[PDB]
Amino acid sequence: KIRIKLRGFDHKTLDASAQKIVEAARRSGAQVSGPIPLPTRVRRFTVIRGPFKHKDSREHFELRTHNRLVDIINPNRKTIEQLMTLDLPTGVEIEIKT
Amino acid sequence: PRSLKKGVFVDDHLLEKVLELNAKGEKRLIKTWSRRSTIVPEMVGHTIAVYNGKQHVPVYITENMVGHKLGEFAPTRTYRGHGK
Amino acid sequence: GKGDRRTRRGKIWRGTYGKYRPRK
Amino acid sequence: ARIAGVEIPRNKRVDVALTYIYGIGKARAKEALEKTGINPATRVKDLTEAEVVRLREYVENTWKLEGELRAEVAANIKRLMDIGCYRGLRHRRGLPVRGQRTRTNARTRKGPRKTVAGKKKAPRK
Amino acid sequence: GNKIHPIGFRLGITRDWESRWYAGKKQYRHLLLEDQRIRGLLEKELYSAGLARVDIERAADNVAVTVHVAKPGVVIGRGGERIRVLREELAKLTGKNVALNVQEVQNPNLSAPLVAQRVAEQIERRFAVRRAIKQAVQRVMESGAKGAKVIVSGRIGGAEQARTEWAAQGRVPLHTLRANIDYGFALARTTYGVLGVKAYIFLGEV
Amino acid sequence: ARRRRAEVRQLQPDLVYGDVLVTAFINKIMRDGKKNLAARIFYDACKIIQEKTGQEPLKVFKQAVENVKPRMEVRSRRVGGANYQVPMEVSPRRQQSLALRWLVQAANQRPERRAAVRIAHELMDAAEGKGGAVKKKEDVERMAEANRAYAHYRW
Amino acid sequence: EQYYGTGRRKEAVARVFLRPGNGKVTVNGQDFNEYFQGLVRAVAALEPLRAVDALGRFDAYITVRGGGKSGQIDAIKLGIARALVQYNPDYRAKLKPLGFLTRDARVVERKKYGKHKARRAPQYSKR
Amino acid sequence: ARKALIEKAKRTPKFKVRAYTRCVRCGRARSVYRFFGLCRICLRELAHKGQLPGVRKASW
RNA sequence: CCGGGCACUCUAACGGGACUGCCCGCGAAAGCGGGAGGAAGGAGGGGACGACGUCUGGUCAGCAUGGCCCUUACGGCCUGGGCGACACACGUGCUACAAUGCCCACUACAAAGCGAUGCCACCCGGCAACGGGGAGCUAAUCGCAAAAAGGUGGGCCCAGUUCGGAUUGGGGUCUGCAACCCGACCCCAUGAAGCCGGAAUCGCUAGUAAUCGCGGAUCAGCCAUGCCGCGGUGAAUACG
Ligand SMILES: [Mg+2]
Ligand SMILES: [Mg+2]
Ligand SMILES: [Mg+2]
Ligand SMILES: [Mg+2]
Ligand SMILES: [Mg+2]
Ligand SMILES: [Mg+2]
Ligand SMILES: [Zn+2]
């Protein structure tokens, strides 16, 4: 009954990762609770375009943090064996907690 | 409608410095920069000189002005009118 | 109106709470 | 009903009429009527001699109103003024005493706007 | 005053970042400073080699760092002793225990960052700006490319009145958000002041 | 409007009489986009119109409108130099715009404290042939035709 | 048995479960005329029923979340218009000439920088 | 930015109310963003280069 | 709420969908008008994106950089004062001059954000700001939050008013080493001008204007009515 929470700036980097974590544990154990999206928190940065004056320049920036769930219930050694061994994504930070 | 709470602040520069004067007599003028100090009974009678940010001014502290922060009797701006 | 700090709206405006605008 | 120093509210609800006393308003008005049993909504006229007594009794004795109040305030303003006190100066000058800007909006304190000549050729905006 | 950075303009599309690492709302301003500190050295003790991009990945006290260069030999070192000096002198900036790499630039004529450097280089020496530009535009165009453009600013030729020399060939569609245009800028300290040098290289499209 | 000939917004009919001139009149009453409070004020007046009168509300409304519509108005125009107020027909479109606007404006000039009252009244007065509405309507028509001579500028 | 429509308006979604019955309406557990008390607009929400003559024929359960009640009225109006079609596809041919089956796409415009409100432009003095 | 004024780096301030910020990069102070430690100018520059991971151009 | 269920709403990733494709008319063609189907129609609505050049445009106080200039000081520390001064002039705004309103009560609809010495449920003390205690959340699963306008009821009765809150007196909370100069907030008292603004002048063509409330960055706290952004209700008018 392990709940995995994957997050990342790139949505495909997660879609990629998360997909693996599923296909993997989709054998050694349960078929997982399916990867779930979860709302995305978004950072905004509104910075005056040029230095000095021109208060009306602006330009908009944003740092979008995506999330996922997966959620694997019924861990069976190998279920955890397909995990700790195979890893890849760089822009993906994982959180496994049952 | 001023505010402070519980601790009516006073810079011990002149505080510990003023209570020592009481133990004896009254020292003519006591230049301070603790414009932020709250006036207290002890200070009464004394003569603390506060800085404008330019000069030290003689301020005879009275019993009816206790509580008012020091300075506040040492104006900063020098304004005599725009008239001409 | 929004100007009066001692009324419902006055508070809401100043975004405060108090006698005139209780935190429920 | 003469309830305070030569005070005399009338023909309106009492909780609104007590407001007409130099030391009372909404807050204190709603208090005195509360602790006097009178129903605010009653017109000063419709008040009962007895009610006018309880009301007047409290009000005049429970607070500092009218003339004496004015006297106090004024006494304070001279007080801090008779000592170097910043506020004191501000009062002598007749300029605001609560750290508001004086380069502009300070009319309510400065009184009528008294224009002067100036330096035109130069966008004073 | 106009024109968006051609790179920043297409990060979502045809153009990856130069630092790709997962979340971090309490350390972002630390890994970043680090990524910076890093590039600091690399864009110094690695200039003469064609420093054309310093990628960086991470994963819990583990930095990747992939210095792309036109002359890796200069990076590696005799037999391979410098790449060893880097790594060490490098972990002196940050513990972390960070890797390193040296992928080469297959043809620096198609590397805007480099082209900028070449032109800025000659200028620093004392070559004919206009020439330098025409030639570079050529090379870049000469070695493939579907378009190229170079822009030197400053006091061209030590002149007192700042100007701006042009030069471009083929297509350099800055608006078409997908063209895939490599951008590069190069400074140019001079006996008489700075000169900015911009290079645009158009490669394929889709 | 340099290019096209601006299309006239067609609004959804009244939710009581299923009429558009009502929605129209209702909007003119509305302020700060409070189309609800605006909606009441009218409907209430409609009742007052049917209490202080036996007539149906909606037909009294129609009457007011029809009586406030100016048929001629004067548009200024530089000619040779001076700006001659020039008389000319009023398009049925504008005729209505001016009517409903005037009704509301006149209504809010009235003294009754309650809004709905003012409208119910001004309208009834309009059907009668009085009230500020009609005064303007006629003051206008009078203004035009009073500047007759300056009409060979047909426009 | 039962019929349904989704209906959305300027950021309000309304699940409409049409059903055969009296003609009562339940919006968020409240009587239709209780959720929309004192809102002249209210009536509109059921206009698509009057179109093909229903109401006194159907009974509807309704979910509504997001926006304001004026927006919800409109969504509800879409959902109703939609379910109506499942019950009888042939309704379209007469339910559409009114456009009830159209999803009003009008929406709150983004607040642009530089201006005060997307469009409201700051004013200048003696330009 | 005076080298001298970048004393702020002195995690040794008589009282913490005196401790301010300053840009990590240009050494500015007028408008630094906590999440980055960079000023509004430095942030746009780095942002554009793609050196700010995950950061991008907001459009909508 | 619980078991349970993925249907619906939603969340987020991919994908379909509109091309004047289809019918009618004008046309040489492009295209124009009209019609059907469609959630949407002829660039469907809003963004990002700004040509070669223009102005000796702006910024050497963001940074960088040529030259000139100071190098017991044109460098550095500290304490205090000043950037907050006022007889005045202008720009941008806020609040308002009221009954389509003000007020008190009860009651209902939102989106986008933010949260570690952080957001703070709930309880208690206090008129209150806030204090003491204390659960939950590392945050679609807890909190900021109350949306306000609106709806139902009740008060005010045309008054400079139960309009409007300036100004001042008094008491107090919180931050911070410290709030005299120079913070914000609470409560009592005070309760100003203002009755819709001369010449002149500004914005906006639709989910726009107008009006209503909500969030964020910076940030100990805050002079924010500024700025960036979110959703609610929602017009008038365009002959030309
Ligand atoms: Mg009031
Ligand atoms: Mg809006
Ligand atoms: Mg600070
Ligand atoms: Mg110049
Ligand atoms: Mg200043
Ligand atoms: Mg336009
Ligand atoms: Zn910076």
Neighbors of chain D with 3 or more C-beta pairs under 8 Å: B
Closest CA to E127 of E98, E163, E152: E152
The secondary structure element, H or E, covering residue G95 is: helix G92-95
Whole-angstrom distance, CA of residue H39 vs CA of residue E53: 24
Q: Among E71, E106, E141, give the residue marking a domain's end.
A: E106
Does any strand I atom come closer than 7 Å to the Cβ of H4? Answer: yes
The CATH number of domain D1-71 is 1.10.8.50 = yes
Determine whether the annotation assigns residue H12 to a binding site: no
CA of F37 to C1' of I156 (A): 20
Which distant-in-sequence residues (6+ apart) come within 8 Å of F108 by Cβ?
F115, F118
Closest CA to B48 of B59, B37, B39: B59
The angstrom resolution of this structure is 3.0
Q: Is the CB of D119 under 7 A from strand I?
A: no
Taking an 8 Å cut-off on Cβ atoms, the answer to whether F15 and G41 are in contact is: yes
Is E196 within the bounds of a domain? yes
In which domain, by residue range, is F71 found? 1-155
Residue of G nearest to F44 (CA): G40
Single out the residue of B76, B12, B74, B1 nearest to residue B40, CA to CA: B12
E8 lies in some domain: no
Across the interface, whether the CB atoms of D89 and B75 are under 8 A apart is answered: yes
Could you tell me the residue range of the domain that residue B44 belongs to? Answer: 1-84
| CATH classification at residue G61 | 3.30.230.10
Contact F43 G40 (CB under 8 A): yes
Does residue E186 lie within any of the structural domains? yes
The CATH number of the domain holding residue A90 is 3.30.70.600
**Which of E106, E140, E156 marks a domain boundary?**
E106
**Contact assignment for G114 to A46 by CB distance below 8 Å:** no
Q: How many structural domains are present in chain A? A: 1
Which distant-in-sequence residues (6+ apart) come within 8 Å of D4 by Cβ? Answer: D21, D22, D23, D24, D56, D59, D60, D65, D66
Question: Considering its fold, how many domains does chain B have in total?
Answer: 1
Total domains in the fold of chain E:
2
E93 and E141 fall within a common domain: no
Answer whether any strand I atom is within 7 A of the Cβ of D54. Answer: no
Q: Which ligand is nearest to the CA of G121?
A: 6
- Residue B35, domain CATH: 3.30.860.10
Q: Note whether E170 and E203 are same-domain residues.
A: yes
Question: Which DSSP category does B43 fall into?
Answer: G
**Domain carrying residue E153:** 107-206
Structural domain that includes position G42: 1-127
The tokens 């606007």 sit on which residue? F101
- DSSP state, residue D22: T
Nucleic acid strand I within 7 Å of D77 CB: yes
DSSP collapsed to 3 states, chain H: CCCCCCCCCCCCCCCHHHCCCCCCCCCCCCCEECCCCEEHHHHHHHHHHCCCCCEEECCC
Strand partners, E168: E149
Closest CA to G87 of G11, G3, G13: G3
Distance G116 CA to ligand 2 centre (A): 10
Task: Provide, in whole angstroms, the distance separating residue G9's CA from nucleotide I9's C1'.
Answer: 14
* Interface with chain A: mutation pick from E17, E22, E31, highest number of A CBs within 10 Å: E22
Contacts by residues E140-145 (CB-CB < 8 Å, ≥ 24 positions apart): E140/E109, E140/E110, E140/E115, E140/E199, E140/E201, E141/E169, E141/E170, E142/E109, E143/E107, E143/E109, E143/E110, E144/E107, E144/E109, E144/E110, E144/E203, E145/E109, E145/E110, E145/E170, E145/E201, E145/E202, E145/E203
Give the helix ranges, DSSP H, for F14-91: 20-29, 35-49, 57-68
Which residues of G in 94-113 have their CB below 7 Å from strand I's atoms?
Answer: 96, 99, 101-113
CATH fold of D72-125, please? 30s ribosomal protein s13; domain 2 (4.10.910)
Neighboring chain D residues of B73 at a CB cutoff of 8 Å = 83-86
* Contact in structure between D81 and D88 (CB atoms under 8 Å): yes
Enter the tokens of residue B41: 């009974």
In a shared domain, residues E204 and E123: yes
Which residues lie closer than 8 Å to E173 by C-beta, 6 or more apart?
E147, E179, E181, E202
Which residue range is the domain that position A14 belongs to? 1-98
Domains and CATH numbers, chain H: 1-60 (4.10.830.10)
Q: Measured between CB atoms, which of F15, F35, F43 is closest to G43?
A: F15
All CATH 4.10.910.10 domain ranges of chain D, comma separated, are: 72-125
From residues 77-96 of A, list those within 7 angstroms of strand I by Cβ.
none
- Verify if strand I has an atom below 7 Å from the CB of D122: no
H26 marked as binding residue: yes
E30 and E94 assigned to the same domain: yes
Chains contacting chain F through 3 or more C-beta pairs under 8 A: G
H or E, element range at A82: helix A78-84
Shortest distance, CA E182 to any CA of chain A (angstroms): 22
Q: Measured between alpha carbons, how far is E94 from B10 in angstroms, rounded to an integer? A: 47
* Strand, coil or helix: F119: helix
- Method of structure determination: X-ray
Distances (CA, A) of E38 to D121, E41, E97, E98, E172: 56, 6, 13, 11, 32
